[PDB]
Design a protein around this ligand. Structure first.
Ligand SMILES: Nc1ncnc2c1ncn2[C@@H]1O[C@H](COP(=O)(O)OP(=O)(O)OP(=O)(O)O)[C@@H](O)[C@H]1O
Ligand SMILES: Nc1ncnc2c1ncn2[C@@H]1O[C@H](COP(=O)(O)OP(=O)(O)OP(=O)(O)O)[C@@H](O)[C@H]1O
Ligand SMILES: Nc1ncnc2c1ncn2[C@@H]1O[C@H](COP(=O)(O)OP(=O)(O)OP(=O)(O)O)[C@@H](O)[C@H]1O
Ligand SMILES: Nc1ncnc2c1ncn2[C@@H]1O[C@H](COP(=O)(O)OP(=O)(O)OP(=O)(O)O)[C@@H](O)[C@H]1O
Ligand SMILES: Nc1ncnc2c1ncn2[C@@H]1O[C@H](COP(=O)(O)OP(=O)(O)OP(=O)(O)O)[C@@H](O)[C@H]1O
Ligand SMILES: Nc1ncnc2c1ncn2[C@@H]1O[C@H](COP(=O)(O)OP(=O)(O)OP(=O)(O)O)[C@@H](O)[C@H]1O
Ligand SMILES: [Mg+2]
Ligand SMILES: [Mg+2]
Ligand SMILES: [Mg+2]
Ligand SMILES: [Mg+2]
Ligand SMILES: [Mg+2]
Ligand SMILES: [Mg+2]
Lengths: 485, 485, 485
């Protein structure tokens, strides 16, 4: 009846979603990767979480490191492994080579290693075991035939013991063999690969589960970051299209625009404002976050094109006061360049700021800034992540997207994200009698009636002023209309 | 007279179509692939199906696994191999190395292995044999010259016995050599390759038959998935252009549109609705599935851009009630992100939901959502698969495709799938006197008369309201017409 | 005086054209390729044809196969090698290793092999010899220096005997070395390579002659297929631009169109009908094949976009009766998806159906369907092949090509095949007073006067109805004209 294999949760954020419940119990898992991919962190975090979350003792077998550096490095992540050792929950088995040039055999006594591991497991009643570097042994006997045999023996004995084991191995190439010998991936039952791929001049960390014998999992690579709390994976494919909806309305900060939108924006919606540079997109954003503050709601403004000081100045020139909204702890401004962090990191930053500040609304100053140097697929996934999260958390979201052209536009955005957006506002230039006028239109609104008029508007020190449609002109959308009466 | 070689059906969905009847009888088949490609599953599923479908006993020769893990892993697929062993239909021959560092010869007694296999075959009257890993032997003698000889001996003896054998081997590279030594593909009579190709950040499983001596087969790769029921292959090239047709009509849910279509849509047809975001494509979809329910017919709505909760809200705003249609078990809504599954998996999901719910109609909320991150060829094949299936099963199908531009469109779709579609509905924006109006046109309808008018329409809380053509304007299709009277 | 070297015809369709008369007499030919490329079939088909066509006895030297499997596999192609052995015309020399682990020398007695071959040649008065796998010997002594020497000895002795020999060798990579050792291509006088290249997810079989010492040949790769009758090569470059012409006219099935074409279409011509989907291209095709049947001529309709059942329905809606035309054995309908076969196979299928049915006319339902997933060069070659063949066989050919856009077209086709077509018919949409009207124009006709008018036409249940030109409008070709009076 499709009986599942029982699994042990790793509690590594996002991992248990990818693996569909964690790692199979009583089996080994092989974690491979190039230097700097976070293999050691994965195997430490595995034992650490087991001990504190489930009260499951464990053993860390060390070959390259020493117990002192394992503990010292761990401290950077907020956890204390020395404490767990003193309490008899964590045990580190030191199998290092020692800083000596002496040798006796030239090989390695695998049998002795296994018996020492078995002893440690029984003594501490370990449920979880990690091995620092299996291949640190095989270097003394590097034929693929002997590697297969010796690895088989280690894996088989661990199964007999019953402890769940995470073995660490190593690779040279990001897209080369799973492990050095082309053997380990055929012997082990469960294979996980950590990568740190260099593309252009940036690095992207990704995790993949190649296989889990006897059980299902998500396939392909999923991005992750290493932060102060350890490994945090972001399996976008695990996000479901099950977000809630409502008929609750919120003001845009602009009264006439609220009328055009049929009584304000929906609270539970994504709003995209597009247009050429200088059309006033950031004016609507500033008024949006102000309205939240006016009603004593928290809001976060994520700035990418302008510094905080410049935002304050421009806001004052429009009759707004950002410093006052900050003093009341209603408005928070987060300024960074798109280039200061990876796209994966920007997503994490947005989520972290939301979790700490608990906003009713957020705004993204420029999606086109975030798209710089980003492929269409990578960018789109970011947008889906941010908008999906905002919907999930019931946060009203206003997003800005700059057009690459100011006349003759055939489209509203070139990012192809208008299928994600619920409400679209267009700001465009219109050339009337030798002058560069502006116009505003509500292009669509999924849950409501909206105005159809393309209305002229002006920007003053009181903010936007929306007037009448261009009734006596043709070809307004093109930006270069002709007068007919 | 072109005498065919008799074949043994594998009963692996789609495999017997690719192989033109299964595997040649009394011959070996070599199945190669990288770790995690499902080689073991293929060879187990082969023996399993033979035993339950044709009552043909078989032998599984094990080198890396143990009988206990073979059985335990198998259980995840719903079948019980332990039961078949107890009944004397399935036999597992344990040729594992044992978890010991001891050795006697350093090579392998192939003669002893063959005699043990022969014994098992005669004892259980086996017709089918599988070998877990032939190359687990060759590792002890890795010269290409000895591998060729020893493999030849194994294959030749199996032919003399008469049992049909599926041998498993291994590869390192997806597009490299068929097998490790560059030998096995020249010795074996029948060669099958399983791949798990990483492209971008996604994996695609494919199956290929490289050759079958003395018999024809389909060529190239064919996609497959591994599901709860084992391997399921989707050989699109095996689908025939032989679908039925009729003059039966069904209502669109919109009375005026039914008139434009000459008396409703054809039941046995594919309908494509295209247009820019905000033109009301999802309004027609909602009314389409409602009409089915109104007549007490089942329908499935496959949602990609909107969650269930949002669909319910938007439907209520248009005077519809989706929850009631669900309570009557007439309407089913399936919501998922395009990124949550592979394109191959989306096709399988659609087919599975149809098989379980038995709909009269289906609708695809957004083909352009499914096309995200998908090459033109991969996408087109998906569309052919879904539409071909819907025609085959006599299911009325409504598909939505968003335009990337809202003005100056030269085409109806950029996916080049309009040659598949039988009926095409276009929704466009028309700029009239400074406002963004909408228009609807039936572009084509293969089996019927249709209206030619491009008609203005409005969307209210009663749904679409289709009016008159723009008789006094020119250049309506461009979206920015000029008035002439 | 440019004395040629006498050649021996292989009678392998297309091969003797590429080789300019077959293989040089009294010399060896090396056939290399990867597993599954049809090397064995080539060498068997060579001996087989020699025996039945020229009554030339031959010897097949076997290393990997056994006589029983050679015969059994051969039967699938309709020929019986056992019969030829019994009659003393075909001899199979068994040089297999036997299914034994025993060895005496560890090398190979080449001298003994040669003497056995010589004996067989004299005994059966062989003129043709094939060798199953030369490299099955060299595996026991794999240095490039010994391979060169031993191969030289074999080739030199065969020349002294005088028999023409086709040797088989093997490769790992499709575009790598000609043979495993980088030797055989320098020793042998005549080198032929068989490939099975994987591009995207499809395989293409091609044949190339790398060199023939002392004689000319066609260069580069030429596509081939393996069918029930063995290897069939399609050397498009061997086709000559020497097709016949005449002033014979045939009706289009539409009376008014016949007038526009100056008295009907030329019998010996290629007619291309282009336009956007829904312009009635398939209406003209249906009437075209009907006219043939009306005059009691056979015609084949090759369908790619529509099933037979749908074609019948749509034809009935236009006042036609396809089933009746089938009963009289005048109309034949061949339905398949473009994806069901390779482009090379589609060409072969068209030729085979023509040879069996002996049509006066053929029609291709959609060239744009066949172009799916096909590069511009591969597609164009297909079109040249089909149209060249149709002209050669004096078959009137009507081809359909769908436009990717319906407004603002600058061109008639994007396939760049209008230079092949003799007569071009354009169907376009014209937007008149808010409606989507249609228009028909004869764009060109190489051998005749044709009308210049762009005429409005309607489609009813009586088929097309062609009226008057748009005399009072400008910019008709653009599809969005303006009225001037
Ligand atoms: N507190 C922290 N905050 C952010 N990043 C950190 C922190 N601590 C460590 N890192 C990063 O995480 C990475 C973890 O490296 P790790 O030791 O897991 O690599 P490894 O694969 O074990 O190395 P090797 O392959 O040489 O054994 C480090 O390269 C470091 O840059
Ligand atoms: N005090 C003011 N009075 C009148 N007009 C102003 C004032 N402040 C700004 N503007 C106008 O607003 C425009 C800038 O708009 P805003 O900064 O809101 O968005 P944007 O800069 O167009 O967006 P992007 O950052 O993509 O360019 C300027 O071109 C300027 O003419
Ligand atoms: N119940 C299930 N549902 C979905 N997927 C499954 C299920 N059970 C197994 N799988 C997947 O199918 C794959 C089958 O792997 P399999 O053991 O066939 O690989 P293999 O080629 O035999 O491995 P190796 O090359 O190491 O011998 C697994 O990697 C697993 O992810
Ligand atoms: N209750 C309503 N009254 C008036 N107009 C409405 C109402 N509900 C929705 N609309 C209009 O319908 C439009 C959305 O149409 P719909 O959601 O059916 O397809 P779509 O969203 O254009 O397709 P896509 O998802 O590709 O954008 C909105 O722009 C809005 O103006
Ligand atoms: N009756 C048939 N109809 C269609 N195709 C066939 C038929 N018989 C054989 N074939 C195909 O033709 C191919 C001929 O393979 P062939 O034995 O020539 O390969 P090979 O190069 O000799 O193999 P190897 O390199 O392993 O010696 C087969 O792979 C098979 O798929
Ligand atoms: N009985 C009929 N009465 C009136 N018009 C019809 C009838 N049958 C079909 N039509 C019209 O013919 C059009 C389809 O034309 P046809 O199928 O001949 O070529 P096509 O479908 O445009 O070519 P493609 O397959 O490339 O789209 C439809 O759009 C429809 O309006
Ligand atoms: Mg480490
Ligand atoms: Mg700005
Ligand atoms: Mg396996
Ligand atoms: Mg929609
Ligand atoms: Mg062969
Ligand atoms: Mg057609």
């Amino acid at each position: 009846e499709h009986q599942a294999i029982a699994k042990m949760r790793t509690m590594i954020e996002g991992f248990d979603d990818i693996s569909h419940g964690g790692l199979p119990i009583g089996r080994s898992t092989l974690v491979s990767g190039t230097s700097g991919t976070g293999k050691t962190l994965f195997s430490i975090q595995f034992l650490y979480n087991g001990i504190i979350e489930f009260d499951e003792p464990g053993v860390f077998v060390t070959f390259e490191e020493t117990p002192q550096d394992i503990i010292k490095n761990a401290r950077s992540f907020g956890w204390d492994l020395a404490k767990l050792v003193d309490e008899g929950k964590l045990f580190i088995l030191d199998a290092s080579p020692d800083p000596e040039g002496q040798e006796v055999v030239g090989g390695f006594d695998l049998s002795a290693l296994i018996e020492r591991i078995n002893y440690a497991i029984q003594k501490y009643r370990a449920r979880r075991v990690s091995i620092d570097s299996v291949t640190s042994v095989f270097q003394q006997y590097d034929a693929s035939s002997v590697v297969r045999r010796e690895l088989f023996r280690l894996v088989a004995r661990l199964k007999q013991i019953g402890a769940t084991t995470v073995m660490t191995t190593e690779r040279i190439e990001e897209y080369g063999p799973i492990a050095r010998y082309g053997v380990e991936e055929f012997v082990s039952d469960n294979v996980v690969i950590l990568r740190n791929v260099l593309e252009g001049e940036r690095r992207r960390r990704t995790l993949e589960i190649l296989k889990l014998r006897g059980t299902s999992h998500m396939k392909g690579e999923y991005p992750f970051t290493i932060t102060d709390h350890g490994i945090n994976i972001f399996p976008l494919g695990a996000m479901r299209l099950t977000q809630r909806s409502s008929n609750v309305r919120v003001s845009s900060g602009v009264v006439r625009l609220d009328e055009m939108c049929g009584g304000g924006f929906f609270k539970d919606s994504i709003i995209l404002a597009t247009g050429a540079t200088g059309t006033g997109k950031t004016l609507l954003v500033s008024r949006f976050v102000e309205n939240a503050c006016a009603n004593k709601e928290r809001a976060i403004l994520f700035a990418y094109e302008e510094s905080r000081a410049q935002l304050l100045r421009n806001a004052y020139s429009w009759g707004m006061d950002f410093e006052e909204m900050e003093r009341q702890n209603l408005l928070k401004i987060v300024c960074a360049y798109p280039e200061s962090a990876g796209l994966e990191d920007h997503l994490q930053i947005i989520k972290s700021e939301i979790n700490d500040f608990k906003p009713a609304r957020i705004a993204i100053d420029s999606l086109s800034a975030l798209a710089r140097g980003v492929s269409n697929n990578a960018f789109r996934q970011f947008v889906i992540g941010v908008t999906g999260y905002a919907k999930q958390e019931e946060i009203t979201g206003l997003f800005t997207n700059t057009s690459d052209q100011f006349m003759g536009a055939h489209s509203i955005t070139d990012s192809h994200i208008e299928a994600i957006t619920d409400t679209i506002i267009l700001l465009q230039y219109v050339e009337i009698r030798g002058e560069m006028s502006r116009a505003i239109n509500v292009f669509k609104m999924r849950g409501s009636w909206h105005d159809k008029a393309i209305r002229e508007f002006m920007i003053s020190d009181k903010g936007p002023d929306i007037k009448d449609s261009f009734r006596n002109f043709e070809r307004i959308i093109s930006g270069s209309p002709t007068r007919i009466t």
